[PDB]
Each structure stands twice: as structure tokens, then as C-alpha cells.
Symmetry: C5
Subunit: 213 residues, 5 copies
């Protein structure tokens, strides 16, 4: 009930309920099924690209959501949603497999827990990757391939599900960038290695971009 959203004690009790139920270190696997983690990046900017090193700086909003039904409550007469520090929640152990720098999180480390058990988490992140930035000054542009998946959970435990959607890019990418976006695709992928046969699901995010002009 949105009318009850600003009931302070209601919010405090939901938070208390969330923290009691939450097992921040245990994957929330409903029904003997992998946790489905939906992710999609919204690029905000492309910063220091170096063609002498093949490195780029990106800023993106990591739209991330999953379900934990044990967190659900009755919101007939209480807030529909509250904000919760992620230290009180299980959060998927996502990583950019091919990153070359730490994720620099630029935003308050809070998620939204919806009364149905849905969790929404969208950090703004600056991070460096190794990219093919050779044709960045040409009309065909450059490509970054960013791969994001669970660092330690294989596909029986965590499933990673991407959403490619370029229509709303305009709402996100800075208009003052040295660069423009030709194309973003975010595709579901599976990773295996010679040593280790189990499949790890990831989103492969392809950023095709070039200098304006």
C-alpha cells in the first residue's frame, strides 16, 4: 500500500523482519532450483580510452534483480518496498571475469526489497577493461567485451539472465561524452575451462562505440 509507505514503524519492522530471515551468506534457492539473477548494464560514460594500451574506463549502472520469497510480506496495509543495506542481504557474487581493475562503486550500497520478495540492486560502477580500441577514431568504432557472472556459483546454483535493450540508452549515457554508442548487446553465455568442467553462466556485454565526429 503506497499510502502506508511512509509509516516509519512499519518500515522499521520490515527491516527487522528482513534481517531476521535473511541469510546473507546462503544462496536463496527456491524449489531445488538455481537462483535466477537478472542483469543488464546501462552505460553512463566511456572515459579514459587508451589505444596505446587497449584499456578503457567505463561507468555503468548494473541493474540487478532476483527473488527471495522468504523475504515477502503482506503489504495490504504496509509499505510496498524498503531500502536495505546489502550487508544485510544475500547478493549474487557477480564479477567482471575479464576486468583489469577493481569495481569502484560510486553509489550508496543499498538494495530495494519489494513486498513480494523481489530484490533490486543497481550500483553505479567505474571499472577498467581491456578492449579492442583500434578503430575507435574510425566510423566502425571499437568494441569492449565485458563478461559478468557469478565468481563461485556454477549454473545449477546461479543462473544469469541478460536483457538487451537499447531504446532507453538515451536516458543513461552522458551527452557530454567523447564517445557515442553504436550498439550494446547483452547475451547469455556459458563458460567452462579445461580444468573445470562445470558450466558458469555469464552475461556477455558487447559495447560498440566510437569517438564523436
Amino acid at each position: 500500500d503506497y499510502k502506508d509507505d511512509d509509516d516509519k514503524l512499519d518500515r522499521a519492522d520490515i527491516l527487522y523482519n528482513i534481517r531476521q530471515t535473511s541469510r546473507p551468506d546462503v544462496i536463496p534457492t527456491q524449489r531445488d532450483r538455481p537462483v535466477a539473477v537478472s542483469v543488464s548494464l546501462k552505460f553512463i560514460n566511456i572515459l579514459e580510452v587508451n589505444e596505446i594500451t587497449n584499456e578503457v574506463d567505463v561507468v555503468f549502472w548494473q541493474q540487478t534483480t532476483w527473488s527471495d520469497r522468504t523475504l515477502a510480506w503482506n503489504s495490504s496495509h504496509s509499505p510496498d518496498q524498503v531500502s536495505v543495506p546489502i550487508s544485510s542481504l544475500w547478493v549474487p557474487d557477480l564479477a567482471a571475469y575479464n576486468a583489469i581493475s577493481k569495481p569502484e562503486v560510486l553509489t550508496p550500497q543499498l538494495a530495494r526489497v519489494v513486498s513480494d520478495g523481489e530484490v533490486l540492486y543497481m550500483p553505479s560502477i567505474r571499472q577498467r577493461f581491456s578492449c579492442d580500441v583500434s578503430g575507435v577514431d574510425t566510423e566502425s568504432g571499437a568494441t569492449c567485451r565485458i563478461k559478468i557472472g557469478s565468481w563461485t556459483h556454477h549454473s545449477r546454483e546461479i543462473s544469469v539472465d541478460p536483457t538487451t535493450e537499447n531504446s532507453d540508452d538515451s536516458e543513461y549515457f552522458s551527452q557530454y561524452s567523447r564517445f557515442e554508442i553504436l550498439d550494446v548487446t547483452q547475451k547469455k553465455n556459458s563458460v567452462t575451462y579445461s580444468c573445470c568442467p562445470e558450466a558458469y553462466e555469464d552475461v556477455e556485454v558487447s559495447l560498440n562505440f566510437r569517438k564523436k565526429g
Copy 2:
């Protein structure tokens, strides 16, 4: 009253009361209305500026207020205000939407709590932004916009409001800066996304400045 300001025991007890009552993770919505958060940036210095890449590096005192009547106390014969570590208080989850570096806090992380429940928090912050830097070498100057709002609380839950609409920050801006501030305007602004319909309020700050001839 200010005759009792330096009563050590009083301050200690006020701090104790604040801590017992304070819920650092719950928005202090009094009645059933959004928390009104007032924000005003006083710019202190423009350190670096890149016209080619449209980035700025600035220092600013972020004057921040809101009130939590539950923290209030009768101060006829006690301190009117004390200093409180913000780890003991709720603070709004503000983020600069077009920031490209972590805000670097340069000051003790303390807030002032007033006996009427008003909270004042003014961190000195250094941070980088993507904004319009063109015109910096002209008489008219560049106009750089900085949008700041709550990261996770929509307008039903938090309202952001600019304190001052203008100023030049002459009481604040360094006289030794290679730049000079022409004007600073602060404006209420609203943001929505086509994925997510609820409105998030923000203050949009416009910094009109230029290089010294």
C-alpha cells in the same frame, strides 16, 4: 540554552538519547509524508578541467539538512546542539547522478543535531563529474550541471530541495583558484525512467565558471 552548552554530562546524555532513539537505516518519515531533505553546494575550488573530455574536478561543502522530531529534546537548561558521528544517524542516500569518481570526503564525518530535531551535515567533498565544460575560456564561461538525489528513495519517500537558489560562493570559493565562478544556481528537478516509473527528486546544480584571462 547556550549557558549550558559546555555541560559535559548533559552532552553525553543527549548523545546517549540520540543513539537509543536513532534508527540509522530507516527513513525518518514523520507523519505520513516524505522526508524533506535540503541540499546546497558551496563550491570551494575547481581543481582540474578537461574541455576535450568534459570532466571537472571540484571541491564543495555539501550543506545538508533534514529533521527528525524524535531526536528532539527540551533544551531550556541543556545544550542546544551536539556533534554526532553520522554512523549513529540516519543520513539520506544521496548520490551525484553524473559523478564519475567516488566522492572523497575531506572532513570529520560528524553531523550537528539541534534540540528541535534538525540535523545538519556539511561534508567537504572532492569529486569528478561529466558535464558541459565548453565556453570555459570565454567571457560567458562554461555551465556545468550536477544532479544530486536519493539513490533508492522515490519522491513519496524522500524529497530533495535546494536551499539557496543562487550565490557566487564568495564567502567560500578560493580566491587562489585558476578559475572564477560567475554564478551557481540550484534547482528542484525530477527524474523518471522508462523502466521504472516512480519519480525520484533531485537538486540540479548549475556551476557557471571560467578560466582567469
Copy 3:
């Protein structure tokens, strides 16, 4: 039982068990024998190189395993493995003896504990080293040696066992790098000092690489 892998309560119970049993600060020596730690670096990228100062800046996945049998459980009808924050576990105090920068860990700091007591830990690390960069612009390439071993545990306490394989890390190394890996090999070595006769085992990693 992999069919039980997703039994949430099972997982939570395993984790609680692991935490009750685990001594994060004590080496898990079994049968009064040294802890065998297998290490394996998989290079992700080589970022910058200075032939004048003999420095390299690299990113690598450090494949690390060891056993702690006291953590073992019967998985007849429960998960085969769980993820565990390494703050809850003993991890070997490994260091690169020729690092000239701090190990910048890029990944979530978790290990896998397997029901037989096996622990797998694989941080992605960016770090700078001092090593031989001569020949980086020749077709033989440079050969940069990186030495990693325990910082405080001598060889009767921790033994380091380099493993397979011999490869150019093709499944791992970025194709977008300005460098190519010719070869990566690993070798067991030992270190002693005239102040300190006890032997410290290390893996010696030889990175043979050149500029494109």
C-alpha cells in the same frame, strides 16, 4: 548429491558446520604433516611493461587448493559444495616474493568448500613485479619469473606444489592485450637465507611473453 545442491537449509547447515569447525588462524596440518598447497597462475592480461626499469603490471587468476579434512561431511543427500567467505576459513599466507605493489584483488573473496574437505580459492589479482623484461620486443620474448610462497610458514608447515600445465594460457589471456604469451610454466623452488636456515617453498612461474 548434486540433486540436493539447491537445498537451501542443507547449504545453511553446511556453512554453520564449517564455521563451527574452522580455525581460520591455524594451519590445517593433517597426520602431523605439512599442508600441501597447490598453486597455479592463469594470466588474464599484461598491462604495461618497462624494459628499462624491469617492471611488469599483470592480472592473473591464482588457482589455489588445499585440503582441510576436518571440514568434510557426508553428501549422500546434501550439497557437494558451498561457497564460503574466506574470513571464515584458513587460507595460506601466500606472497609474491618479488612483488613491488600490493595485490589488488578484483573478485568476491569466497572459496569453495567441497564435501571431502577440499578448499578451492581463486582470486583475480592485479599486481606489479620486478623481473627480467629484456627481450620483450624480440621474437624469443621476455621471460619474467614470479615467485610465490608462504610468508611465514617454512617447508615443514606448508609445502607448495606447482602443478600442470604447460600452456600459453589461451583460455584465459585477453586477445585485446598488446602482448602475447609465448609460454607459462611453473616449477617448485625453495628459498633460504643465511639468517634463517629453515626452507620456504615457493612456486616459480615463468612468463615468456612478447609485444605484438
Copy 4:
């Protein structure tokens, strides 16, 4: 009693007593008057100077004292002083008002507590400032001024006093700097703002220096 300094049990007991009595978050006012804080900067090095940007990068020892006579003990047969982590103590919430970078503390964060309740704190700090570097390469030199005061406590609560008005920091400043110090002067003022009537005290440090030749 200096004969008793190395009595371990005594030291431990003193530290226990200090921690039991200490209120790290409460200003140690005595007799309902402002905490008197003595501050003095001993400059060690001037690293980088930029006359275009008016920035300096310096290293100094911040000599800092104040009294909390509640920490005092009878040292007739016990150590005169002990070292205490400052997290176990109240420390003034000092900040450089014209700092453009975080204070980098280079030394163990320890204070000395004296049996008479005197507290001595001296971090080595490297920090960048916005100040006057006009004339760095003249024989008269540049006079860079730094203001340091409490961030959240007005003059009725904390008073900040320079210690020795003038020296040339002979026993401190690196003989290997490419700059030389002509004079350092430290004087009281106060700062007020039209928004905020109450007065904040600070020490204003004037650093007169030039490049050697």
C-alpha cells in the same frame, strides 16, 4: 615517577582506566568552558608546488594538545605517560579549511596521555592545499596560508590556539627539500558565514617559502 615507566602492569592498568573514563565522542569541557586546543604545524617537506594552479603538497607534524583532567591519575609510583590509540580517546574534529585533498596520516595513530590529564597528539600528515604560491621563485618568496579549525564545534565549545607565533622549523624541515622556509607564522582568527552567525576558531598558518638556487 619515571622509575616506574616500565612497570607493565601499571601501564596496562592506566590504559584500562583511561578507556573506562574516556568518552571518545563527547567534548571534554571543564568548568563549563570551551575545550582549549593548542595547535602548531612543524613543516617537514614541500614536495610539489604549482604557481599556475596555486596548489602545494606538503608534509607536516601537527603538534596538538588539550586537557581532559578526568583522565588524570596519581603518578607518584606509576608511569607519567602512556601511549593510547586515539580511537580510545576524544580527539578534536580538526580540518584544514583550504585543503583540497584528504589528510594522509603517515604515522601510528597514537596519543600520549600524561598523568595530569594532558593529551598530546602529533600525526605526520601529507596534504594538498589551495593557497598563495605567488612569488615562489623570488627572494621574498611565497606566503602560503592554511586555516585549521574544528569542523563542527563553534568557539563556545572549542577554542583553537596557535602555540609559538614564529619559528623557521629548523629542527624539522628536511635539509633535502628543493625549497627553503623563510618564516612560519601562526595566528588566531575566527570564521563566520552569513548563513551561520556563531564563530568558528582556527589557527591560520602562514608559510613563507621559496625554491633554493
Copy 5:
């Protein structure tokens, strides 16, 4: 004895005894005499040398030992040594008096505690220094002096004593550095200031090095 070194229960009990007994914030003075701290820097690399600014950036292993007999135990049929997190131990508050950057620790922060109560601690540290760099390009090389001592403990509480006085660090220094070490000498030194009477002991490390030709 070493045949019991891998007795896990024993190690655990030793670590438990050490933690029960240890006072990490109190100097381990025995016999009411100053704590004897032995220090020697083994240099690993000389990364950067600046002759215009007289700065030096090095990596060294700070070999450090002292004794706390209260930690001792009977090792007839138990381990002779264990590794201990330095957070559980008292460590001397050492600082480089001419450091201009924070000591960056590159190694696990663990010490060895021997059953006779000796403590060994050897962090690899990367740090920057202001020191005399003139002559680095000559045959005689540069002699860069580094002074390390307790930050808050004077001569009656802590005595710093150089271990080896002369070495070329040939077992430690990288063969791959562009510099080479002619000699490393370490001398006991003492330091006082006009403001403050009592003496502070330190080790003067003279690093005589030059560019390879």
C-alpha cells in the same frame, strides 16, 4: 620440538594461550627496563629516484624482533613457533621520520612467536622518502639516509637497536633493478627537540646506491 610442529591442536592451544596473555596496546617491558627492538632493513628494490626533488621510492623487508617472555611456553613436546596475526600482538609503533608516503605493506600481516617468547615480524614495505640522492649517477653513488624509530615511546620505554651494521643485501636485492647497492649501513641514533626533552631512539639506515652503468 619440530617433530610436533604440525600438531594442529597444539598450535591452536598455543595461539589461544598467546591471545589470552597478549596485551596488544601495552609495551611488553620486562624487568622494569626498556623494550629492546631489533630492526634491519633488507632492501629489495629501488623503483624510482628523483634528483630534482630528492625523493626515493623503495621496497624493503623490515626485519623486526623483540621479546615478550610472558608469551613463552614449554616446547618439549609442542611446536617451537607459530604464526600469529599482528592484531593479536603488541607491535612497536615504528615510523620513518623522513617518510613522505604511507608505508604500503605488501605481505600478510603475521608474526612468528617462538616458544622462548621471541617475536619475529618482517613486512615487505613499499615507501617513499625524502633523502640525499645526489651522486646516484656517479661511481661513489648516492647515500640516502632513512631514520626509523618509535613515534610515541622515548628512550626509557623502547630502545631501537640495529642488527647487522653492514651488508650489500645481495641475498635480497633484485638483480633486475636499474640500480645496485654499494652498501647498507645501520647505526643506533637518538633524537630530541627543543620543545621536548627526552630522547627518541632510532636506526639510521644509510643506503649507498647508484645507477648501473
